[PDB]
Structures are given as structure tokens and as C-alpha cells.
Amino acid sequence: MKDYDELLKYYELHETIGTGGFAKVKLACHILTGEMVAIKIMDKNTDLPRIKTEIEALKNLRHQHICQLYHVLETANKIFMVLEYCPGGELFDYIISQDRLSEEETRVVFRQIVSAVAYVHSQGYAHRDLKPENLLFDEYHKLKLIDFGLCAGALAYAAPELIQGKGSEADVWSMGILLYVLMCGFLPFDDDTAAALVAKIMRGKYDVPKWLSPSSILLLQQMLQVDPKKRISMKNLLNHPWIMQDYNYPVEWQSKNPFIHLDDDCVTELSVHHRNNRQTMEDLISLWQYDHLTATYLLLLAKKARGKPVRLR
Amino acid sequence: KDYDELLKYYELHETIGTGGFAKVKLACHILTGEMVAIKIMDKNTLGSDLPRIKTEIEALKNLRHQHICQLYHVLETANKIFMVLEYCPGGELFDYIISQDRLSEEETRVVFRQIVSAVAYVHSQGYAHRDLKPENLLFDEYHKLKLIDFGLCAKPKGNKDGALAYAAPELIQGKSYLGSEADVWSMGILLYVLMCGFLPFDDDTAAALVAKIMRGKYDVPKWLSPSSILLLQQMLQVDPKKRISMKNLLNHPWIMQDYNYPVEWQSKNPFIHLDDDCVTELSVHHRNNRQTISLWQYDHLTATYLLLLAKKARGKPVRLR
Numbered sequence: 001m002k003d004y005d006e007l008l009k010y011y012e013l014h015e016t017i018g019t020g021g022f023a024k025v026k027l028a029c030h031i032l033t034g035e036m037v038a039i040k041i042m043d044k045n046t047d048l049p050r051i052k053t054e055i056e057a058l059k060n061l062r063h064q065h066i067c068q069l070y071h072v073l074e075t076a077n078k079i080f081m082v083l084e085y086c087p088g089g090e091l092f093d094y095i096i097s098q099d100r101l102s103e104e105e106t107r108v109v110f111r112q113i114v115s116a117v118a119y120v121h122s123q124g125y126a127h128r129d130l131k132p133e134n135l136l137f138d139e140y141h142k143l144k145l146i147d148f149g150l151c152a153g154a155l156a157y158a159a160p161e162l163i164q165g166k167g168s169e170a171d172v173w174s175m176g177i178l179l180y181v182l183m184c185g186f187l188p189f190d191d192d193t194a195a196a197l198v199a200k201i202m203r204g205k206y207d208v209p210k211w212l213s214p215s216s217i218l219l220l221q222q223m224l225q226v227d228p229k230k231r232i233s234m235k236n237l238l239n240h241p242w243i244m245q246d247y248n249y250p251v252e253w254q255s256k257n258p259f260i261h262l263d264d265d266c267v268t269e270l271s272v273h274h275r276n277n278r279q280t281m282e283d284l285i286s287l288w289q290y291d292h293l294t295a296t297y298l299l300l301l302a303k304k305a306r307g308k309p310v311r312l313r
Numbered sequence: 314k315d316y317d318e319l320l321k322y323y324e325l326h327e328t329i330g331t332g333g334f335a336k337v338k339l340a341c342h343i344l345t346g347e348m349v350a351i352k353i354m355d356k357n358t359l360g361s362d363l364p365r366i367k368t369e370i371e372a373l374k375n376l377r378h379q380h381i382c383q384l385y386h387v388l389e390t391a392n393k394i395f396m397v398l399e400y401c402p403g404g405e406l407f408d409y410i411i412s413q414d415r416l417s418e419e420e421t422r423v424v425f426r427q428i429v430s431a432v433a434y435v436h437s438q439g440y441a442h443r444d445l446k447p448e449n450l451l452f453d454e455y456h457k458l459k460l461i462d463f464g465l466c467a468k469p470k471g472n473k474d475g476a477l478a479y480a481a482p483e484l485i486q487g488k489s490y491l492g493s494e495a496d497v498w499s500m501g502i503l504l505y506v507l508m509c510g511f512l513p514f515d516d517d518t519a520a521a522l523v524a525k526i527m528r529g530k531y532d533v534p535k536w537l538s539p540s541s542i543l544l545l546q547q548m549l550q551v552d553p554k555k556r557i558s559m560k561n562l563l564n565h566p567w568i569m570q571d572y573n574y575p576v577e578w579q580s581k582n583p584f585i586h587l588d589d590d591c592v593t594e595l596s597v598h599h600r601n602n603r604q605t606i607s608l609w610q611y612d613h614l615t616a617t618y619l620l621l622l623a624k625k626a627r628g629k630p631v632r633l634r
């Protein structure tokens with residue numbers, strides 16, 4: 001197949017592992033690094049603006065809690081997105097397998113969600129589709145935010161002002177719904193029709209189960225404010241008393257994953273693969289075209305970060 | 314929830330894949346303990362693909378075959394359609410093709426006789442699949458093919474309603490067809506990609522692919538046996554009236570080679586002849602009498618009966634907790 005010729009120069013394709021925005025996701029191996037990847041396969045003959053908004057957000061976003069874009073390939077009838085492999089499943093799966101999570105367990109997970117969304121917002125974006133299906137665990141059981149198809153969703157996770165049509169404050173409401181579903185195992189607003197769900201969201205009344213601590217209840221009232229001018233700010237969420245209870249330091253949201261600083265060990269290994277001198281290699285890396293080069297650089301950087309040698313072939 | 318009625322019957326596991334444009338999850342059927350694939354359709358998200366879901370469900374209600382991935386249970390809620398299906402952990406025929414060089418003729422025959430079986434059964438039921446491709450064939454846990462994705466299936470003689478490389482000439486132009494001849498073309502495309510590792514008609518644009526399909530001219534690689542070449546010419550006839558019939562495909566010499574018996578296409582999976590170890594265990598658990606199951610509503614009863622029948626076929630006890 002001519003649709004897979006350029007792909008298979010770079011990647012050893014494995015089995016179907018899932019789904020991403022109606023696109024199939026397959027396991028693969030990046031050949032040069034030996035590193036495992038997720039490949040999202042789009043058919044461009046069978047939601048094209050959604051694909052392009054995602055790609056363009058993922059080109060500008062780079063963070064420890066955002067599932068990394070490595071490589072975009074485009075053929076006759078296909079778009080391939082080479083992404084960070086998350087074998088740990090969805091946060092959805094995790095919620096439904098236990099009944100809910102304990103307060104201590106959802107702090108661990110929720111501090112990662114806060115980190116990622118605080119970073120998204122600092123870049124001038126709102127994700128506009130925060131939900132547990134859209135968070136995946138990596139090999140180290142750390143959350144990675146996916147689905148950037150809406151940018152700057154599920155009705156149950158949508159803010160009041162969003163349903164009215166009257167942008168980053170709506171994400172805080174969506175993290176509130178998330179906080180609740182984690183500790184409860186059910187949504188705070190749920191109905192059999194869309195109009196009854198909408199009316200529930202507009203009222204802002206929800207059950208407070210017995211097992212919820214007063215600290216949990218306070219944070220939920222601050223995030224699940226129907227008035228977005230009354231909603232908790234990102235600033236005050238970061239060092240909220242609930243957020244800092246077992247970790248007496250605020251959420252570190254700032255990216256540890258740069259666009260500007262280049263790892264010298266990776267540049268010298270890329271130079272020996274390419275047969276060239278630095279500054280030709282750095283200038284090439286710094287272009288960030290989301291081609292085989294950025295894939296290999298970022299996966300060499302991920303190889304180095306797991307302790308394994310910063311080596312190619 | 315959206316998941317309240319589902320979770321009475323199934324223990325949900327992880328996301329394993331995609332069916333059409335919908336999530337597939339691993340699950341366990343609580344009563345029988347048997348593993349299951351659950352296709353999840355969001356009702357107010359997919360919209361324009363709702364008639365595709367209903368065409369699949371209605372075909373899968375009327376098709377029951379050893380080489381068709383089995384429908385157990387349809388659940389419909391507020392914002393969801395669940396299809397509970399036969400678990401196929403062996404991956405796609407696509408994966409098998411892309412993992413190695415071309416298959417040997419003998420490897421192809423093994424696999425291709427199963428494709429013929431399934432499609433001859435589909436056609437005997439008055440259907441045409443219309444989307445035959447190696448992504449729509451899955452291996453079960455004993456490495457046997459199961460036909461999937463009936464969203465574009467049609468009754469060619471009934472009431473009215475794929476991949477371009479697999480599409481028949483008359484299908485790209487839209488002719489007055491008995492519709493099942495287009496599936497024979499697609500199996501010929503399949504036969505070629507299996508023995509060659511590449512498609513007989515392939516281009517960088519859709520218009521150049523279409524024109525190649527209309528001409529009907531393709532390379533015959535050196536490694537292809539004369540037997541293979543003959544069968545390919547019979548199936549890859551551009552005139553659907555000149556294409557090999559299902560009848561002559563079933564006992565074709567290439568097909569018969571090494572096996573020396575024709576493809577057995579008729580279903581070993583009945584709607585009528587109930588194996589009553591299942592009926593008697595369905596009578597003890599569900600406290601009522603043996604005057605049936607035969608309604609086949611694709612509810613929890615259909616699922617449990619068919620999975621009990623599967624659990625018996627595995628050797629495991631005919632038991633309902």
C-alpha cells in the first residue's frame with residue numbers, strides 16, 4: 001500500500017490499541033530510537049477542521065502532562081499523527097474499575113490535571129473538552145491530556161455560560177465536574193434528555209454524598225460556581241488548601257519540556273547520525289517541522305530521560 | 314449514568330479499538346464470565362452516521378455464522394447505543410499482511426477460504442457487504458477470521474439504502490446491479506494484496522486510482538503461480554457479468570488445491586436448533602419453564618444464551634452464577 005510507504009520507513013507498525021477522534025490508534029515502534037509510539041490514523045475521505053486545530057495546538061503545546069506530538073505525515077488518503085505512548089488507559093477506566101477514588105487518590109491525579117490546564121491557559125488556549133476519557137496514563141502512571149480538536153464538548157462537563165453562548169473559566173467548571181466524578185463515581189448533573197441536563201446545570205444544584213470531606217465540598221463549591229465571575233481562579237486553584245493538603249507546595253504547572261533549550265547529548269547523537277556539524281543540526285532541530293527529525297530528537301530526549309543510552313539505530 | 318443498565322450485565326475493561334467511528338472496549342459478561350467486545354455509539358455526537366449503525370444492527374440480527382463476528386446484545390440509553398459483540402483478540406488481517414512480506418499461496422488459501430465462506434453466507438441471505446477490506450476481517454483467539462463492519466451492507470434485491478482501492482468498476486460509476494458481483498471483485502483485490510503485498514490498482518490521487526480500476530490492467534508479479542493468475546483474471550473482470558459467480562468460486566480449482574473439498578459456507582450457528590444444556594441452565598437460573606430464547610430480541614437473554622453456547626463450545630461448564 002502506497003498509503004503506508006513513508007510511514008513504514010520510520011515506524012514498525014503493531015496492533016490497534018484504541019481510538020482518537022474517530023481515528024484508529026495503533027501501537028508502533030520508532031525504528032531509529034527503538035521507542036514505542038501511538039499512531040493516530042485519519043482517513044481524509046471518510047471532521048477535517050478538528051484534525052487541523054488539534055495538530056496546530058499540539059505544535060505549540062509541549063508539557064509533561066500533555067500527550068506529545070512527535071510527527072505528522074500526510075499522504076493521498078491519510079493523516080498520521082505520531083504521539084506519546086500512554087499504555088495506562090483512560091482516567092475513565094480507572095474511575096469505573098474502583099467505584100470512585102479516595103480523596104488522597106484524586107489529589108494525586110487532580111494536581112496533574114491542574115498542572116496541564118494551567119499550562120494550556122498560559123499559552124492562550126482553553127481545551128474546551130475536559131473529561132476523563134481525554135486523560136490517559138503513561139508508563140509511569142502519570143496523566144497526559146489528549147483531544148485538542150476544540151481550542152482557543154460533553155454536555156455534562158460544559159459550563160453554564162458555555163451552554164448560553166456567553167473562555168478559560170469554563171475549563172475550571174469542567175475540572176470541578178471532573179473532581180466530583182473522581183470522588184463520587186457519578187456526575188453531579190445527569191439526565192436522560194439534553195434539556196433536563198441543561199436545566200440541572202443552570203440551577204447548579206448537586207448532591208453532596210456522605211463520604212465527601214468538608215475540604216472536598218468547599219473546593220467543589222468554588223469550582224462549581226454557576227457565575228464564572230464567582231468561580232475560583234487558576235491562581236487560587238494552584239495553592240488551594242485542598243490542593244496542598246498532603247504536599248505542602250503548590251502545583252508546578254510550568255513546562256519542563258522546552259522548545260528553545262536543546263539537549264547537547266541528543267544534538268551530538270543526531271550530528272553523528274546525520275554526518276554534520278552543530279548549528280546546522282541545531283538550526284535543523286529548532287525549525288520544529290514535526291517531521292522524522294523532531295520525532296527522533298524528542299524520542300532521543302525521552303530515551304535519555306528513562307536512563308537508557310542517548311543512542312540511534 | 315448512561316452505564317447503569319450495561320453495568321448490571323457487563324464488567325467493563327479497557328479501550329481496545331475502533332468500529333466505524335466508535336470506541337470498542339473489552340468487557341466481561343457477568344453471568345457466563347465470557348469476554349466480550351463492546352462498541353459504544355454516542356447518540357447526539359455521530360448524527361449523520363446513525364443510519365449506518367441501524368443498517369449494521371439489522372444485518373447482524375439476520376446473520377449468524379462461524380466467520381461473522383457475532384452480535385450478542387443491543388442496549389440503547391439516553392445518549393448511547395451499545396453493541397455487545399464476539400471478542401476477537403487476534404487483530405486484523407491488515408496487521409498480518411503488513412507484518413511480513415506477501416503471504417505464500419498456501420497461507421493465502423487458509424485465510425481466503427474463510428473470507429469466501431463468510432461472503433457466500435452473506436450473499437445467500439440476500440445481502441452484499443460492500444466494504445470488504447483487510448481492516449474488516451479480525452482473527453478470533455483460535456486464529457479464525459470474523460467479518461466485521463456491516464454499516465455499508467445492502468440488500469441488492471431488497472429495499473434501497475467503501476475503500477476506493479477495493480471498489481468494483483460498476484460501484485464507482487453506480488450501475489443497475491444485483492450488487493453481490495461487486496463483493497467478488499473486492500475478494501479478488503484481497504486475494505492479490507495477500508499474495509503480492511501491494512494493491513493491483515494504486516495511485517497518489519483518487520482520480521488516477523479510479524481510471525486504473527476502469528481499465529482493469531494490473532501487474533502479474535513473477536512469484537504468482539499460473540493457478541493464482543487464472544483465479545485473479547476471473548475475479549478481477551471489469552464487466553460484473555463476466556466475473557466468476559459465487560457458485561464457481563466455491564469449488565474453483567485454486568480453492569480446491571490441497572483441501573480437495575469445496576468451501577463450506579453454510580452456517581454452523583443456528584436460529585432454530587437450540588442446544589438445550591443452555592436451555593436447562595437458563596431454566597434453573599432464570600426461574601421459569603422450557604417453552605423458550607426463540608424471540609431473538611438481542612437483549613440480555615440472547616447474550617447469555619449465545620455466550621453460554623460459546624462457553625460450552627470452549628469445553629468450560631454450562632453454568633450461570
Ligand SMILES: OCC#Cc1ccc2ccncc2c1
Pocket residue numbers: 017018019020025038040067083084085086087136145146147148
Ligand atoms: O492528542 C491526540 C491523541 C491521542 C491518543 C489517543 C489514544 C492513545 C492510546 C495510547 N497511547 C497514546 C494515545 C494517544
Ligand SMILES: OCC#Cc1ccc2ccncc2c1
Pocket residue numbers: 329330331332337350352382398399400401402451460461462463
Ligand atoms: O461488525 C461490527 C463489529 C465489530 C468489532 C470491532 C472491533 C473489535 C475489536 C476486538 N474484538 C472484536 C471487535 C468487533
